Amino acid sequence: INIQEDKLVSAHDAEEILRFFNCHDSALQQEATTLLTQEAHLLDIQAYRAWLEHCVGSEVQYQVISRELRAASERRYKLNEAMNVYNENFQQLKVRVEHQLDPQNWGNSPKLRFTRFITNVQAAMDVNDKELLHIRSNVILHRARRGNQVDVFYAAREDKWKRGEGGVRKLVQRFVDYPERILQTHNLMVFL
Amino acid sequence: INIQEDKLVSAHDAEEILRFFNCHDSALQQEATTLLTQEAHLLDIQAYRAWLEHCVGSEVQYQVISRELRAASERRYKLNEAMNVYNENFQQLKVRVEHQLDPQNWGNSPKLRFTRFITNVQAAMDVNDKELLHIRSNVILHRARRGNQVDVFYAAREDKWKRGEGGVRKLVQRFVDYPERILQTHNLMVFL
Amino acid sequence: INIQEDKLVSAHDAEEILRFFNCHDSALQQEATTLLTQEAHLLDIQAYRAWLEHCVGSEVQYQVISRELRAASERRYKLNEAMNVYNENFQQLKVRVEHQLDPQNWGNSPKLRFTRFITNVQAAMDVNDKELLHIRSNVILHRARRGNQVDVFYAAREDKWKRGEGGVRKLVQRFVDYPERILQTHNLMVFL
Amino acid sequence: MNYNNKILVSESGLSQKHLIHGDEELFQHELKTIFARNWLFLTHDSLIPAPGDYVTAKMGIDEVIVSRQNDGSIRAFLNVCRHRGKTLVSVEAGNAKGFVCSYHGWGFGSNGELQSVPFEKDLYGESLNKKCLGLKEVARVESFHGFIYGCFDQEAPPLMDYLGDAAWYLEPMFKHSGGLELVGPPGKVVIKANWKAPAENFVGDAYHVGWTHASSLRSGESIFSSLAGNAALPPEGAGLQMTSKYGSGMGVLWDGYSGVHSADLVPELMAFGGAKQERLNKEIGDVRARIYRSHLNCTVFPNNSMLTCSGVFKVWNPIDANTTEVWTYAIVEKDMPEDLKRRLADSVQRTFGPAGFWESDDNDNMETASQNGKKYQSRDSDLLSNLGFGEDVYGDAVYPGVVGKSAIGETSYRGFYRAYQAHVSSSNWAEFEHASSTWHTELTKT
Amino acid sequence: MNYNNKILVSESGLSQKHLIHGDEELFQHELKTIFARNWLFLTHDSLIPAPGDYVTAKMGIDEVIVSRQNDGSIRAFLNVCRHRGKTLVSVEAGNAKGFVCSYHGWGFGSNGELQSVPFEKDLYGESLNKKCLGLKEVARVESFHGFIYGCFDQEAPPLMDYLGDAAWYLEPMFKHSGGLELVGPPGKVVIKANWKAPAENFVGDAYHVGWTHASSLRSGESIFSSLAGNAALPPEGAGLQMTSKYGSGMGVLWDGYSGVHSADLVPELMAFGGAKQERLNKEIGDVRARIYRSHLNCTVFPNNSMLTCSGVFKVWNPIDANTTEVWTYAIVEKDMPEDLKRRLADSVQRTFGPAGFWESDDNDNMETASQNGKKYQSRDSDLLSNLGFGEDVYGDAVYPGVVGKSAIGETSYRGFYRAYQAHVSSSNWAEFEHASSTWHTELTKT
Amino acid sequence: MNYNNKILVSESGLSQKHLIHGDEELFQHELKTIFARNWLFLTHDSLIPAPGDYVTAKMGIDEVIVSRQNDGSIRAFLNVCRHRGKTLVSVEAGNAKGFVCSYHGWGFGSNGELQSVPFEKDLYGESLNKKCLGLKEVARVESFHGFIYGCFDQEAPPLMDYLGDAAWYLEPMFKHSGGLELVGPPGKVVIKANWKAPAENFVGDAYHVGWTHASSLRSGESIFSSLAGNAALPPEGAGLQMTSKYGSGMGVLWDGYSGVHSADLVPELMAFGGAKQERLNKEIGDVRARIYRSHLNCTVFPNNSMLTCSGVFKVWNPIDANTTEVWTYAIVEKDMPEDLKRRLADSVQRTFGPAGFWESDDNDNMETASQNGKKYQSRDSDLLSNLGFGEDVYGDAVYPGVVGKSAIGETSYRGFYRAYQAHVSSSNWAEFEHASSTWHTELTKT
């Protein structure tokens, strides 16, 4: 990709493409698929502690941004381009997990229902850190509650996973640039 | 998973996780993916007879439940927790298939359009019955009819498949706990 | 499939089933998955030139139809059954790509956000043309723009891919029969 | 629209303006003159049998909490906190001695009383009059053989009188069978129809069965199956239709005890119903014992319907003029073997539940008939319900109410819509009564 | 709002209150005074050529069945059963001798007559007056060279008179070319705009083309392509604008026979149109033969538009004040080679269909201009259509109607909105006529 | 509904009819009497600091462009083209000397002037009066220490007077701290609540904190954490409540400088605020320096709220009676270290942003309390705000406004709703003033 020719493509997106076009490792794509499917299963059944213990690295940055709408031709206005819907370290994820599990979280009664659909999995080892695994995947996340509330979330996820305690691969970075500027789902209180 | 610690997790869900975390068989996950993709293809083109003949075991239980909303802290009220949207044996599935194919089913003219998206496939052989295959998968089911009617269904499916006539693996149990309590899709007249 | 018995099945759909039930090649399904995932990635980041260069054959027919609603029992009325939402050769795709990239395409500022979910991939080599690869897959396409506009498209894609320049497999035919008769997405200005 | 003057339903209930299924202003008017005035189904004893048991239910567009009291009675209250109006209860069923609001923590008893306010002494001192801050209570709650109905209007007739002539037909199954139980939880589905479309269909529409349900009749092998595709008209004396002063009505299809149930239940049911009928002959006489094991398609005005013997029990909960939330329960006879009750409940949902293949046959009929009521050229058009007019009787020696002695007709439509029009044009029960003093004469003209 | 008095459109059509694109009460009023009163496009002979052929169409928010009769005529009927109001036909096109309702099985003929009622003898006896139960028929159905229009109002002018001065401009392509065919089925898409936004755009908006469609002009290489990004103004005498008494109007862009079609069709089309023009010179004279092969952007009042030569044919079907269902067909000349017709049809959809890249350029313009009409500070604001005012003529020796002799202006907006205001403030055709007795004088002031 | 006569808010603001959260006609009336009349938050200097910088903002349901002029001033204009009403600007922020419409290419300056019209000379000649075609300008735009508010009503009091007694409480943080910056872009989420539900909650609801936010208090370890699950009532003198003539009000929680921030920020914040307080003692006195580092939950009437020290800044943008678009910014003190500002901004969004776990606790409370206002049996019910009534004072020697000298009460609800009712029943500012001439006496009765 030449972003001077492909005018709509950002430098960041072009860099990420390059990562997966190169050394395609079939076995790695399958390991990644397993990792993400099991992670999604834990989240869907609301096993948030198990998710932290099994899927999330101590050094994690879990980040979801919302980017301000700017002109495609904009070149002068240089103030903060995005805010962080999430930008969590492990302890901050733990706070959110405890908030979910608290018996006085009134919003969680009756129990919520989550269904996640993970697709378009791609995987590639980092060039310089042969222990760092890049995984890209897309998620549709369906949340249903209280009879007739239904919220569906859609996102692409740029992950880094690395082997941790016991040799288990764990999430050390998740980055999502949320595609909808104004949320129509009451909140973004779901783990993408 | 310890459900005393992971307070939001049901005993049933914790049992099902355990099934897939253990002996991971890559080839089995691929066989399962093929099985479910072909099943979904038959259903999407409304080949309901072919679906019965090729995908459904004579001993099948095809079950979709709707669970009443109860307090997370509820411990005393012990009446029927769920109703069966579906709870069909083979003959009952056949009745539904004949109803679909009947030329006086006025609702089927003009012809419906189905598109199914199957994701998050997991597969594991049963411990005790080495011929029983457990398959878990999620479905998004899109049904379009009559110009501007569009209904989208979302569900997780807990299946058991077993080799039948000709050695063909067939569905012997499907269990779905439908995530939305009040349906907003006119009906649930689709085979999840 | 016997379409005399399976009354709801079209001759075309029955023919396409037959294609994938026969020689199942696991490696081919994986190659196809990679091809479609990379194609979807290029489209999602709006690398339309790269998509043309890397994914689209010079002899392509890119076709999306909308079929008029007719009675299931209809046998006499024989006028044009469908119109072409798309029916593009390579040059016509190029026109559409240039239209997307034009700096005076006002609709593209602020920049659109695309997320594609590709599932149900099936692949089979053509019987007679051993260089022609048939690939079937389903797509959910999410387009978000201008704060609160969200459009979701759903479709099954019947593709033919063939090795071109440099031995790269490229799309030589895509056929989609769009499932919704009346679009509720403002337009169908997305590459399915 | 002036509801005092506007003729929405013509004399004798012969026709109705199509706008009644589409007009939102009329829907709003119905909240007052239909739903706030009449008896509405809440629950059954079997779903809240013990002290502290509660369910939530809709009454019109309002939500109520329905609770078994310590003394064995049932009281119902608006599911709305008396402080800043938050919804009190977010679940569908449970057991509790009270309900605490998740906003500021006010605690109400199962009896609706405001029992506790956090830090009351420090904050309100002695100034908060909790005695005046009880949950807004449903004025009237009565039981018909375990079936619990509510009414916001203190002036309503007792539930038994409200059922009028329909009660006589329901009693063999509801009372003399030893009693019914409601099997929950219900299926719940939203359809894009006016609540009146399914209500009118269940109250009196046998005509549609052979054609609408052709595919279900042919596929399921049930006992009404000879009707499939209008292949055969039921014989003379196959049944009757009735209607009543306050709008409730039903069709009676003689002997149809296995109802819509597929052949896999027919022999067992036909044996069970016949056995109980033989016992009932001695108690309530041959005719009423036969009614017990006859298929009744009934609407209890305004929006509760049922198919006895089939065991289908429906609430058509109104949302707006073209939106209805359908609740589906199963009814079973208490003395049926437990395994039969379970299979009957599943069969009710199989045929008429969220994925009920019979109920699906009705979708397009109800939705389009309703939505067409909004279309400009149809608003002032006349929906016809004249079938059988001029052949109805009143005061028959055997069968009470306004009765059409034929299985298929529109007798029950006419009585339903006569009552509907009388309510819509009235400001209170006294005016309804005045508007209804010649109700049966109006229905039996010509 | 008092529609007798409220000035929604100012004198000479110079401005309109922005609320007209957003006000739901006015939308409801338009159902009566615009859609129930005026001629609306239904179909073409080419889509229902044989006896029994039918299509469904919208007329306003109503749906009709449009059927070729045995005698060769066309009749149209509300798609609503006369019994309980169910939608009769659920498909878009077919061939049938009649239509049976899926609710209770009533059978209507292609001629709208109630022909059969299931078990009529046993149920209704001789009491059902089927003669009075025919489908509600569209009062007026007329053809303009194969293009079939309907009108619910028996009092409307004949379609030809209704087209007024616009007919003269359409005739070379619609009549003298040997005739047009409509290629179906149409594309169908919902946009979040008022129906008037695209109607006004097609009737008279050449100004927007260079800027709105900059990207499509630059990318497609069509013959109007010099306009891209307002790089170049069309020369003097590049075209004209016209409007008429009953609201129809159009722009004329001289010689633009290949229209919006991309370069891959330009040489073939320019050859074909020029060849036919050379023949037509002898028949209808040079000017009219030139009009035949000139690009006309036209709205047939109220909600049917077209681009001749480009071959785009549109119905803007109203749903509510900010919702419109867009139907897109292709028009082709009957004597074109079949392969050219096929490629032209695909090109119409390529440019202006559901994925029409030109039509997509217009989306935000129409949707936001419409939605802004609901915003509080904009409701009472004035949309301007004064371009070219004071330079229009009437009664010209060569070009009839109210005419602006320039390619770009707002002449056709003014005539469209003058007619719109006259209808909205009138209770019937007689009042419209009275309100329109000085229509051209009003438009040519100053 | 007659808004002159209808008592929507009872004397002394003691109660409000529940319908106010659900009634769409009243919502439409509020567009006129609340949103078109009062001061509404637009942006901050920090988001448009340089000439040409602009943002879009809502004012009620209207959208405006807010632009920094060359002279350093700020002007705001309807985001609507003066030609055919298209939305001019489709982005949220940028820098430009002007805005060109994508429909017909009209070019407006950053000063709102119509500066260019494509081909003006050839098309309009000299006839287009561009001087009269400037964008519709917001009549009043004023700054409160960098915070920019707009008002469509030229007759409004100056912003400073409008803030009334609330200004005294805001000044230590807004002015004497050296100044605040707004960190953008905001989070944006739609909730299904009336705008008044969160506005009333932020203006005066400390009561809900311990119970609603039990889980967030317990999980986050913030400094208000002893409140979790109503485990502990704040001591005597923990804070106060105030309200003002024009409706703005707030709670004051003494010393709570780290606010809702989780323990990871508590020590740093408590150190920083205390250090600045020690400097401020000498400047503005001990009490006001203490107010600077005290947690203020404030609503600037009608729909702008904030938590000082926590740094949460909210706009509750109205969509309809049960729909609100929530904008969330972070406020930081200009002289904080940049790293602290960044972490504070993230923490504001962590707690109260689109995925704010605290804000999520409030969802069901606001949404259901609002939606219940549409339910038939609740419309005429009374929402209570009587806590602390009869203990409020006015004209206190230290704390100005109508003041309740307790941390938890409903003082600020009463003043908010008193002002609301006075506006709703008034046609202009003069009538509001007349309706408010005994405002504090009304609030301090008994």
Ligand SMILES: C=Cc1ccccc1
């Ligand atoms: C109204 C539904 C019905 C279903 C079966 C028999 C009679 C009536």
Ligand SMILES: C=Cc1ccccc1
């Ligand atoms: C109004 C659309 C249009 C398109 C091309 C030429 C003239 C007008």
Ligand SMILES: C=Cc1ccccc1
């Ligand atoms: C109204 C929200 C709030 C949050 C924290 C403290 C005081 C008030």
Ligand code: FES
């Ligand atoms: S709203 Fe229920 S306690 Fe306040």
Ligand code: FES
């Ligand atoms: S509604 Fe058509 S036959 Fe009854």
Ligand code: FES
């Ligand atoms: S609408 Fe803006 S230039 Fe015409």
Ligand SMILES: [Fe+3]
């Ligand atoms: Fe039915």
Ligand SMILES: [Fe+3]
């Ligand atoms: Fe255009």
Ligand SMILES: [Fe+3]
């Ligand atoms: Fe709160």
